[PDB]
């Protein structure tokens, strides 16, 4: 199950990069 867990781990980890900068760009500009 490690290989099955490995393929879903990277997708569960790749989201962090796409869930920081867009948040760093939106919630900052949801204040104007």
């Amino acid at each position: 199950d490690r290989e099955a867990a490995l393929q879903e781990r990277e997708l569960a980890a790749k989201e962090v990069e796409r869930l920081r900068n867009i948040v760093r760009r939106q919630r900052k500009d949801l204040k104007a």
Partner: protein, 49 residues
């Protein structure tokens, strides 16, 4: 005849007892805190975490 008319007309609107809490000033606080910041309270820190 108009006592039961105008009184309930505001009263039926004023049945929204709960939603006023962010309406508090002029619905502007609702526009300021009911979604402007409470939905932003999480997302403000939902990147630093």
């Amino acid at each position: 005849e108009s006592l039961p008319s105008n009184v309930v007309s505001s009263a039926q609107v004023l049945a929204n007892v709960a939603n006023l809490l962010n309406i508090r000033d002029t619905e502007l606080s609702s526009f300021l805190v009911a979604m402007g910041d409470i939905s932003l309270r999480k997302t403000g820190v939902e990147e630093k975490r």
